[PDB]
Amino acid sequence: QVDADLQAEIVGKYNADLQKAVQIEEKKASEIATEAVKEHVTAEYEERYAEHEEHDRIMRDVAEILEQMEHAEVRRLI
Amino acid sequence: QVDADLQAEIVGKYNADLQKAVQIEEKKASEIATEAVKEHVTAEYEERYAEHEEHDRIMRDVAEILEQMEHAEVRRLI
Ligand SMILES: [Ca+2]
Ligand SMILES: [Ca+2]
């Protein structure tokens, strides 16, 4: 589904940050924080791969990795 | 915390829609769908109460109601 290297890179760098964002109990602030983490990661990869031939596939993978990370932490806390 | 009438109005109108959005298994589409429901509700209330004296309080209540609805359904499915 997703590129395993892309998954390792994003999980490695950003999972702890996304976890902290999800762990904020005040739900508005948590939503804002989670979105901020996602937006940063998306922008980092967009900048890095803007002209790459597999750009569209990469960006779909980044979006899926981020959503799976969020889902895993929401599940894990519940 | 939130105005009980505002809560009843938004839950009554939009909970089933937010539930369907959260229930979509494909996580990107679910995220897009949930955000679309939230954006509509926020815009409806912003338009209705743009000049009201309690606008800021109302809009914070709308944001909290929407986040609580999302949390309740994510919890309920898990
Ligand atoms: Ca999500
Ligand atoms: Ca939320």
Swiss-Prot record, chains A, B:
It is found in: Cytoplasm. Involved in mRNA degradation. Catalyzes the phosphorolysis of single-stranded polyribonucleotides processively in the 3'- to 5'-direction. Belongs to the polyribonucleotide nucleotidyltransferase family. This is Polyribonucleotide nucleotidyltransferase. It comes from Streptococcus mutans serotype c (strain ATCC 700610 / UA159).
